[PDB]
Write an enzyme that holds these catalytic residues in place. Sequence first.
Site, PDB file in Angstrom:
ATOM      1  CG  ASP A 121      75.365  -5.391  55.316  1.00  0.00           C
ATOM      2  OD1 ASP A 121      75.820  -4.904  54.325  1.00  0.00           O
ATOM      3  OD2 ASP A 121      74.345  -5.990  55.462  1.00  0.00           O
ATOM      4  CB  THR A 159      74.833  -7.727  51.093  1.00  0.00           C
ATOM      5  OG1 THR A 159      74.524  -6.226  51.570  1.00  0.00           O
ATOM      6  CG2 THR A 159      75.605  -8.556  52.228  1.00  0.00           C
ATOM      7  CG  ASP A 261      73.042  -2.853  54.904  1.00  0.00           C
ATOM      8  OD1 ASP A 261      72.112  -3.761  55.230  1.00  0.00           O
ATOM      9  OD2 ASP A 261      73.376  -2.545  53.705  1.00  0.00           O
ATOM     10  CG  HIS A 309      77.372  -2.534  50.191  1.00  0.00           C
ATOM     11  ND1 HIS A 309      76.673  -1.796  51.136  1.00  0.00           N
ATOM     12  CD2 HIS A 309      76.863  -3.754  50.363  1.00  0.00           C
ATOM     13  CE1 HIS A 309      75.795  -2.507  51.743  1.00  0.00           C
ATOM     14  NE2 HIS A 309      76.061  -3.712  51.179  1.00  0.00           N
ATOM     15  CG  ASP A 687      84.923  -9.044  25.070  1.00  0.00           C
ATOM     16  OD1 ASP A 687      85.155 -10.109  25.002  1.00  0.00           O
ATOM     17  OD2 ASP A 687      84.745  -8.408  26.262  1.00  0.00           O
ATOM     18  CG  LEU A 693      88.751 -13.186  29.244  1.00  0.00           C
ATOM     19  CD1 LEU A 693      88.687 -14.491  29.137  1.00  0.00           C
ATOM     20  CD2 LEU A 693      90.070 -12.614  30.023  1.00  0.00           C
ATOM     21  CG  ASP A 695      86.365 -11.606  20.652  1.00  0.00           C
ATOM     22  OD1 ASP A 695      86.285 -11.789  21.949  1.00  0.00           O
ATOM     23  OD2 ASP A 695      85.539 -10.830  20.063  1.00  0.00           O
TER      24      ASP A 695
HETATM   25  C1  LIG Z   1      88.294 -13.363  36.561  1.00  0.00           C
HETATM   26  O1  LIG Z   1      89.156 -14.679  36.794  1.00  0.00           O
HETATM   27  C2  LIG Z   1      88.679 -15.984  36.353  1.00  0.00           C
HETATM   28  C3  LIG Z   1      89.123 -16.928  36.937  1.00  0.00           C
HETATM   29  O2  LIG Z   1      90.571 -17.315  36.705  1.00  0.00           O
HETATM   30  C4  LIG Z   1      88.293 -16.242  34.921  1.00  0.00           C
HETATM   31  O3  LIG Z   1      87.310 -17.150  34.597  1.00  0.00           O
HETATM   32  C5  LIG Z   1      87.988 -18.448  34.184  1.00  0.00           C
HETATM   33  O4  LIG Z   1      88.108 -18.251  32.448  1.00  0.00           O
HETATM   34  C6  LIG Z   1      88.324 -19.291  31.894  1.00  0.00           C
HETATM   35  C7  LIG Z   1      88.185 -18.659  30.215  1.00  0.00           C
HETATM   36  O5  LIG Z   1      86.799 -18.194  30.110  1.00  0.00           O
HETATM   37  C8  LIG Z   1      87.557 -20.522  32.209  1.00  0.00           C
HETATM   38  O6  LIG Z   1      88.279 -21.585  31.567  1.00  0.00           O
HETATM   39  C9  LIG Z   1      87.360 -22.547  31.034  1.00  0.00           C
HETATM   40  O7  LIG Z   1      87.006 -23.654  31.949  1.00  0.00           O
HETATM   41  C10 LIG Z   1      86.177 -24.487  31.463  1.00  0.00           C
HETATM   42  C11 LIG Z   1      86.011 -25.536  32.792  1.00  0.00           C
HETATM   43  O8  LIG Z   1      84.968 -24.832  33.615  1.00  0.00           O
HETATM   44  C12 LIG Z   1      84.545 -25.480  34.869  1.00  0.00           C
HETATM   45  O9  LIG Z   1      85.799 -25.768  35.512  1.00  0.00           O
HETATM   46  C13 LIG Z   1      86.236 -24.526  36.212  1.00  0.00           C
HETATM   47  C14 LIG Z   1      87.564 -25.452  37.413  1.00  0.00           C
HETATM   48  O10 LIG Z   1      87.047 -25.743  38.527  1.00  0.00           O
HETATM   49  C15 LIG Z   1      85.211 -23.718  37.077  1.00  0.00           C
HETATM   50  O11 LIG Z   1      85.836 -22.788  37.718  1.00  0.00           O
HETATM   51  C16 LIG Z   1      84.357 -23.393  36.396  1.00  0.00           C
HETATM   52  O12 LIG Z   1      83.209 -22.698  37.017  1.00  0.00           O
HETATM   53  C17 LIG Z   1      82.462 -21.970  36.230  1.00  0.00           C
HETATM   54  O13 LIG Z   1      81.133 -22.529  35.760  1.00  0.00           O
HETATM   55  C18 LIG Z   1      80.105 -22.934  36.650  1.00  0.00           C
HETATM   56  C19 LIG Z   1      79.123 -23.472  35.990  1.00  0.00           C
HETATM   57  O14 LIG Z   1      79.321 -25.020  36.013  1.00  0.00           O
HETATM   58  C20 LIG Z   1      80.009 -21.745  37.686  1.00  0.00           C
HETATM   59  O15 LIG Z   1      79.480 -22.236  38.780  1.00  0.00           O
HETATM   60  C21 LIG Z   1      81.097 -20.701  38.197  1.00  0.00           C
HETATM   61  O16 LIG Z   1      80.459 -19.746  38.767  1.00  0.00           O
HETATM   62  C22 LIG Z   1      81.812 -20.452  36.724  1.00  0.00           C
HETATM   63  O17 LIG Z   1      81.016 -19.714  35.833  1.00  0.00           O
HETATM   64  C23 LIG Z   1      81.801 -18.517  35.130  1.00  0.00           C
HETATM   65  O18 LIG Z   1      82.656 -18.999  34.044  1.00  0.00           O
HETATM   66  C24 LIG Z   1      81.990 -19.641  32.971  1.00  0.00           C
HETATM   67  C25 LIG Z   1      83.075 -20.249  31.919  1.00  0.00           C
HETATM   68  O19 LIG Z   1      83.626 -21.407  32.397  1.00  0.00           O
HETATM   69  C26 LIG Z   1      80.989 -19.029  32.392  1.00  0.00           C
HETATM   70  O20 LIG Z   1      80.356 -19.647  31.379  1.00  0.00           O
HETATM   71  C27 LIG Z   1      80.134 -18.338  33.418  1.00  0.00           C
HETATM   72  O21 LIG Z   1      79.115 -17.337  32.771  1.00  0.00           O
HETATM   73  C28 LIG Z   1      80.796 -17.811  34.554  1.00  0.00           C
HETATM   74  O22 LIG Z   1      81.262 -16.651  34.188  1.00  0.00           O
HETATM   75  C29 LIG Z   1      83.766 -24.636  35.586  1.00  0.00           C
HETATM   76  O23 LIG Z   1      82.642 -25.394  36.358  1.00  0.00           O
HETATM   77  C30 LIG Z   1      86.592 -24.994  29.983  1.00  0.00           C
HETATM   78  O24 LIG Z   1      85.268 -26.050  29.726  1.00  0.00           O
HETATM   79  C31 LIG Z   1      86.731 -24.041  29.080  1.00  0.00           C
HETATM   80  O25 LIG Z   1      87.434 -24.678  27.758  1.00  0.00           O
HETATM   81  C32 LIG Z   1      86.781 -24.587  26.823  1.00  0.00           C
HETATM   82  O26 LIG Z   1      87.460 -23.352  26.052  1.00  0.00           O
HETATM   83  C33 LIG Z   1      88.694 -23.736  25.650  1.00  0.00           C
HETATM   84  C34 LIG Z   1      89.489 -22.401  25.279  1.00  0.00           C
HETATM   85  O27 LIG Z   1      90.987 -22.527  25.569  1.00  0.00           O
HETATM   86  C35 LIG Z   1      88.962 -24.698  24.739  1.00  0.00           C
HETATM   87  O28 LIG Z   1      90.307 -24.931  24.161  1.00  0.00           O
HETATM   88  C36 LIG Z   1      88.235 -25.870  25.055  1.00  0.00           C
HETATM   89  O29 LIG Z   1      88.014 -26.850  24.132  1.00  0.00           O
HETATM   90  C37 LIG Z   1      86.752 -25.637  25.635  1.00  0.00           C
HETATM   91  O30 LIG Z   1      85.782 -25.463  24.693  1.00  0.00           O
HETATM   92  C38 LIG Z   1      84.914 -26.349  24.596  1.00  0.00           C
HETATM   93  O31 LIG Z   1      83.742 -25.997  25.317  1.00  0.00           O
HETATM   94  C39 LIG Z   1      83.030 -24.846  24.624  1.00  0.00           C
HETATM   95  C40 LIG Z   1      82.032 -24.415  25.292  1.00  0.00           C
HETATM   96  O32 LIG Z   1      80.980 -25.349  25.701  1.00  0.00           O
HETATM   97  C41 LIG Z   1      82.537 -24.938  23.127  1.00  0.00           C
HETATM   98  O33 LIG Z   1      82.499 -23.889  22.462  1.00  0.00           O
HETATM   99  C42 LIG Z   1      83.806 -25.702  22.336  1.00  0.00           C
HETATM  100  O34 LIG Z   1      83.249 -26.243  21.214  1.00  0.00           O
HETATM  101  C43 LIG Z   1      84.489 -26.811  23.149  1.00  0.00           C
HETATM  102  O35 LIG Z   1      83.859 -28.110  23.141  1.00  0.00           O
HETATM  103  C44 LIG Z   1      87.695 -22.797  29.738  1.00  0.00           C
HETATM  104  O36 LIG Z   1      88.956 -23.536  29.808  1.00  0.00           O
HETATM  105  C45 LIG Z   1      87.434 -20.938  33.557  1.00  0.00           C
HETATM  106  O37 LIG Z   1      86.361 -21.904  33.892  1.00  0.00           O
HETATM  107  C46 LIG Z   1      86.923 -19.507  34.595  1.00  0.00           C
HETATM  108  N1  LIG Z   1      86.808 -19.709  35.827  1.00  0.00           N
HETATM  109  C47 LIG Z   1      85.988 -19.056  36.554  1.00  0.00           C
HETATM  110  C48 LIG Z   1      86.118 -19.564  38.019  1.00  0.00           C
HETATM  111  O38 LIG Z   1      85.141 -18.334  36.280  1.00  0.00           O
HETATM  112  C49 LIG Z   1      87.895 -15.042  34.211  1.00  0.00           C
HETATM  113  O39 LIG Z   1      88.328 -14.837  32.758  1.00  0.00           O
HETATM  114  C50 LIG Z   1      88.715 -13.670  34.757  1.00  0.00           C
HETATM  115  N2  LIG Z   1      87.569 -12.521  34.135  1.00  0.00           N
HETATM  116  C51 LIG Z   1      88.760 -11.663  33.621  1.00  0.00           C
HETATM  117  C52 LIG Z   1      87.825 -10.321  32.880  1.00  0.00           C
HETATM  118  O40 LIG Z   1      90.033 -11.731  33.689  1.00  0.00           O
HETATM  119  C1  LIG Z   2      69.876 -10.463  54.751  1.00  0.00           C
HETATM  120  C2  LIG Z   2      71.312 -10.254  53.893  1.00  0.00           C
HETATM  121  O1  LIG Z   2      71.768  -9.546  53.256  1.00  0.00           O
HETATM  122  N1  LIG Z   2      72.370 -11.544  54.272  1.00  0.00           N
HETATM  123  C3  LIG Z   2      72.021 -12.679  54.407  1.00  0.00           C
HETATM  124  C4  LIG Z   2      73.054 -13.141  55.678  1.00  0.00           C
HETATM  125  C5  LIG Z   2      74.392 -12.960  55.486  1.00  0.00           C
HETATM  126  C6  LIG Z   2      75.231 -13.273  56.755  1.00  0.00           C
HETATM  127  N2  LIG Z   2      74.447 -13.387  57.760  1.00  0.00           N
HETATM  128  N3  LIG Z   2      75.603 -13.875  58.742  1.00  0.00           N
HETATM  129  C7  LIG Z   2      76.949 -13.798  58.161  1.00  0.00           C
HETATM  130  O2  LIG Z   2      77.666 -14.154  58.841  1.00  0.00           O
HETATM  131  C8  LIG Z   2      76.640 -13.553  56.809  1.00  0.00           C
HETATM  132  N4  LIG Z   2      77.526 -13.351  55.872  1.00  0.00           N
HETATM  133  N5  LIG Z   2      78.645 -13.680  56.308  1.00  0.00           N
HETATM  134  C9  LIG Z   2      79.558 -13.723  55.142  1.00  0.00           C
HETATM  135  C10 LIG Z   2      80.801 -13.137  55.594  1.00  0.00           C
HETATM  136  C11 LIG Z   2      81.919 -13.219  54.258  1.00  0.00           C
HETATM  137  C12 LIG Z   2      83.115 -12.692  54.682  1.00  0.00           C
HETATM  138  F1  LIG Z   2      83.855 -13.015  55.724  1.00  0.00           F
HETATM  139  F2  LIG Z   2      84.132 -12.847  53.549  1.00  0.00           F
HETATM  140  F3  LIG Z   2      83.087 -11.465  54.655  1.00  0.00           F
HETATM  141  C13 LIG Z   2      81.444 -13.822  53.184  1.00  0.00           C
HETATM  142  C14 LIG Z   2      80.225 -14.229  52.909  1.00  0.00           C
HETATM  143  C15 LIG Z   2      79.428 -15.001  51.513  1.00  0.00           C
HETATM  144  F4  LIG Z   2      78.357 -14.789  51.367  1.00  0.00           F
HETATM  145  F5  LIG Z   2      80.165 -14.389  50.711  1.00  0.00           F
HETATM  146  F6  LIG Z   2      79.933 -16.253  51.532  1.00  0.00           F
HETATM  147  C16 LIG Z   2      79.283 -14.404  53.880  1.00  0.00           C
HETATM  148  C17 LIG Z   2      74.409 -11.473  54.789  1.00  0.00           C
HETATM  149  C18 LIG Z   2      73.589 -11.412  53.610  1.00  0.00           C
HETATM  150 CA   LIG Z   3      75.613  -5.346  52.540  1.00  0.00          CA
HETATM  151 CA   LIG Z   4      86.187 -12.076  24.310  1.00  0.00          CA
HETATM  152 ZN   LIG Z   5      71.935  -3.335  52.761  1.00  0.00          ZN
END
Ligand SMILES: *[C@@H]1O[C@H](CO)[C@@H](O[C@@H]2O[C@H](CO)[C@@H](O[C@@H]3O[C@H](CO[C@H]4O[C@H](CO)[C@@H](O)[C@H](O[C@H]5O[C@H](CO)[C@@H](O)[C@H](O)[C@@H]5O[C@H]5O[C@H](CO)[C@@H](O)[C@H](O)[C@@H]5O)[C@@H]4O)[C@@H](O)[C@H](O[C@H]4O[C@H](CO)[C@@H](O)[C@H](O)[C@@H]4O[C@H]4O[C@H](CO)[C@@H](O)[C@H](O)[C@@H]4O)[C@@H]3O)[C@H](O)[C@H]2NC(C)=O)[C@H](O)[C@H]1NC(C)=O
Ligand SMILES: CC(=O)N1CCC(c2[nH][nH]c(=O)c2/N=N/c2cc(C(F)(F)F)cc(C(F)(F)F)c2)CC1
Ligand SMILES: [Ca+2]
Ligand SMILES: [Ca+2]
Ligand SMILES: [Zn+2]
Length: 809
Positions: A121, A159, A261, A309, A687, A693, A695
């Site tokens: 860290d 972190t 850190d 970082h 965008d 991505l 539009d």
């Molecule tokens: C960086 O890399 C990543 C990974 O490759 C890229 O992100 C992907 O981008 C894709 C396009 O944006 C996106 O695909 C969508 O998937 C939807 C299903 O999503 C769920 O399942 C996946 C798979 O397991 C999962 O990963 C998702 O996880 C996200 O959401 C949860 C919350 O539930 C979060 O915990 C998680 O952190 C993550 O959030 C992030 O992504 C979402 C978007 O999914 C953001 O909103 C968040 O802010 C955050 O950034 C999900 O659990 C699927 O539903 C989508 O499909 C819609 O759009 C298509 C277009 O092709 C359309 O055809 C479909 O019909 C559908 O539209 C319908 O829904 C719309 C919305 O309600 C509605 O308007 C319409 O009218 C329709 O009804 C879409 O395919 C993919 O999920 C993410 N993956 C991740 C991990 O983020 C990213 O783009 C890269 N970045 C760059 C800059 O390159």
């Molecule tokens: C107080 C503070 O600032 N906190 C709370 C404690 C936390 C911490 N305590 N002990 C640990 O071992 C640890 N994190 N370890 C990892 C290692 C990885 C890796 F291996 F990929 F690098 C990823 C991740 C994940 F968070 F991303 F899941 C976590 C550190 C941030």
């Molecule tokens: Ca740190």
């Molecule tokens: Ca866009």
């Molecule tokens: Zn710190």
Amino acid sequence: WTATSGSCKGRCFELQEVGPPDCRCDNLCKSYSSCCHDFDELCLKTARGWECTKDRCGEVRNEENACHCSEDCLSRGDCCTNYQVVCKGESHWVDDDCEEIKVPECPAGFVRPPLIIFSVDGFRASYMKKGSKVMPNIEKLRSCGTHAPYMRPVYPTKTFPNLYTLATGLYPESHGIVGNSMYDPVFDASFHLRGREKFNHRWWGGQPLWITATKQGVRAGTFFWSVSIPHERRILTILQWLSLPDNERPSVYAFYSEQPDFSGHKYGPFGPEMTNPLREIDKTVGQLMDGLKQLRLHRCVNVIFVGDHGMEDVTCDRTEFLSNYLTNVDDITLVPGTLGRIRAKSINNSKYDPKTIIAALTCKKPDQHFKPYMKQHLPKRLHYANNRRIEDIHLLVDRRWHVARKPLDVYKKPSGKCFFQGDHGFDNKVNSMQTVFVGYGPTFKYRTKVPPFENIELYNVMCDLLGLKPAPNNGTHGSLNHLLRTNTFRPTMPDEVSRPNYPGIMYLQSEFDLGCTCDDKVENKLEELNKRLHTKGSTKERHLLYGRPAVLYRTSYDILYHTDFESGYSEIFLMPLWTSYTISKQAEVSSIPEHLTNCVRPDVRVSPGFSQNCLAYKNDKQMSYGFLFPPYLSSSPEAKYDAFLVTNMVPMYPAFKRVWAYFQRVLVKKYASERNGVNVISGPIFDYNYDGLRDTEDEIKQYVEGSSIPVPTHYYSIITSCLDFTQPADKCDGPLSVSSFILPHRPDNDESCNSSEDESKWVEELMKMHTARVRDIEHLTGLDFYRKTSRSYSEILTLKTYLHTYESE
Ligand SMILES: *[C@@H]1O[C@H](CO)[C@@H](O[C@@H]2O[C@H](CO)[C@@H](O[C@@H]3O[C@H](CO[C@H]4O[C@H](CO)[C@@H](O)[C@H](O[C@H]5O[C@H](CO)[C@@H](O)[C@H](O)[C@@H]5O[C@H]5O[C@H](CO)[C@@H](O)[C@H](O)[C@@H]5O)[C@@H]4O)[C@@H](O)[C@H](O[C@H]4O[C@H](CO)[C@@H](O)[C@H](O)[C@@H]4O[C@H]4O[C@H](CO)[C@@H](O)[C@H](O)[C@@H]4O)[C@@H]3O)[C@H](O)[C@H]2NC(C)=O)[C@H](O)[C@H]1NC(C)=O
Ligand SMILES: CC(=O)N1CCC(c2[nH][nH]c(=O)c2/N=N/c2cc(C(F)(F)F)cc(C(F)(F)F)c2)CC1
Ligand SMILES: [Ca+2]
Ligand SMILES: [Ca+2]
Ligand SMILES: [Zn+2]
Ligand code: NA
Ligand code: NA
């Protein structure tokens, strides 16, 4: 509730987590207040400390000891790490000469080389040089293995966002860990460093390496260590796990250190107190490598030594207070410190207005040490907008500074003084935020330096090292192949989805009713065939140096050739997707002649129905236009007419035109002079939903008034030349050099506080802030560049992830 009266006997640092209410014996049980009653006694032995001594050698096993020096310890896998050194006359690993590891040298039963991620860290990149004399184990890893001079973290350089990016290959906006503190408005829940909400799985998106491994049948060590478990015990636990039977033994492990850190916050990055934490971390690396050597694993395991970082000098007197700017400071909530995020304190307050908050925070004090942004206006390289956990108003804080809401937040009674001297979180291009990467082992190269790279790339490589297929992520798989001896990943270029039309002359001048004019009615077989050849692509070899960009989505577009530039013209967006041109070192800048000032010419290759029109611009009182190929750089008075074609025109706010015109008239020629010619590819970006991505047509929120001409949110340029600048850009034998930008297309220059001055004082500063990777532009445009070069595809992938940072050494 935990029924803490089960037992950890034979369960110490068990790898499967048992569920409530049954008590736990894993490396995280302390963090949950769930360990069984005998966890400390059995699992956290300390007796006689961590090192064998001469008198302990050959001892009768005493199961109370922290570690063992008895004859049986090697087969038990629980010797103190210095056992063979003290008792069997062996050398410490650090004292052995390095010898290339050409192949894994692993014990029988090992299916693959294990991976150990050793994370530190707050380990700033410059500690590797500045602390080298006190870190001999780390210096051996670094000099003998593969290292980068630094590795770029993700923004914010905090972190949790960075550690989860390491684990997932994802930007924080995609994995969802967008700060150390967060509010999610959908869950109505807050994530804090302290407390229990952070354990809820709904915060953590994507698929981290330990899940990727488990899904694909590769066993993982438990990655996280409760803070109170000493580092020596963490190391002995990993070494014990490596001694498990083949069917039980993990293939991937993580160690984490809270240092440097912890001390860096207290003492600053280079405080004299910092020497001791660095010595202690080096000692831990030594214990690990001595322990691996005793197990005959020191030429088998791949070790990654990686930070999250860096650390900057920050003291509480360098704090800006929002109460010095806002009258309504009590109506806002601020996430403070080295970045600011603002939202309404109450969703019921209908008088809250982000426009007035932005304005009150914009250029109000001469040396103001933060800058406010709506999140969609943040530099695209930060990829910090597409998440509902990221507040609409963001403050980018200058390095060395904090922002806070009110002074009372920063000082504490009775004295009011604060004691911290370091912090981190700033823009991820800031030098003090850079961190470290070293890879050492059979799969990494030997004594090899690699250029700096982003931590988003590492997940792919860790998957390669373990034979795993990575989940979808933001790395560019293949871009780090040059780190690896073997297990490289050899991608194919994506297939072009839309092929271009190559239109000839199809329309007469009088078919156009665009409201445009041009004084071009000004009047030869020699030269006329010549102009026809240019229109058929006779100069395309000079101006399109790396092939035409491929279009990776379905659309209708035309390739248009000219003397001085080539373009791919979109019939859907009514403007080029890209315009490509080469400017040699010897090129001359000329003016736009008087008679051509307001000249726009119909393009007889493209229908009136697929063209812009000048009347739209006349009617839109906010919007003007610019050109993608700059008229200033025409090769001749005659060729200059091509630059005024309606197919080279793009919509531009007058404020943005100041930026653009300076770039085109001054900076392109400057770069060509400095780089020995440049190839430039420029174009629009749309965008409107700030997801990084391209539009589709139905996502466009703004058009030139009355028309179907869409307004770009950004303009990009990719500027390429020969890495060996003794060769001109258009005759380059070897590797390429690139810098790019993605400039926000804004109707004001409020971002630039000095914009009333001559453009020579502020435009290039703006452009540096908005520096970009070619890969960022690919995401934003659906184009794929550098399709035809002499270079290896992995080399081109590296080039596409390059970011020109404009930071000194
Ligand atoms: C960086 O890399 C990543 C990974 O490759 C890229 O992100 C992907 O981008 C894709 C396009 O944006 C996106 O695909 C969508 O998937 C939807 C299903 O999503 C769920 O399942 C996946 C798979 O397991 C999962 O990963 C998702 O996880 C996200 O959401 C949860 C919350 O539930 C979060 O915990 C998680 O952190 C993550 O959030 C992030 O992504 C979402 C978007 O999914 C953001 O909103 C968040 O802010 C955050 O950034 C999900 O659990 C699927 O539903 C989508 O499909 C819609 O759009 C298509 C277009 O092709 C359309 O055809 C479909 O019909 C559908 O539209 C319908 O829904 C719309 C919305 O309600 C509605 O308007 C319409 O009218 C329709 O009804 C879409 O395919 C993919 O999920 C993410 N993956 C991740 C991990 O983020 C990213 O783009 C890269 N970045 C760059 C800059 O390159
Ligand atoms: C107080 C503070 O600032 N906190 C709370 C404690 C936390 C911490 N305590 N002990 C640990 O071992 C640890 N994190 N370890 C990892 C290692 C990885 C890796 F291996 F990929 F690098 C990823 C991740 C994940 F968070 F991303 F899941 C976590 C550190 C941030
Ligand atoms: Ca740190
Ligand atoms: Ca866009
Ligand atoms: Zn710190
Ligand atoms: Na106008
Ligand atoms: Na300004």
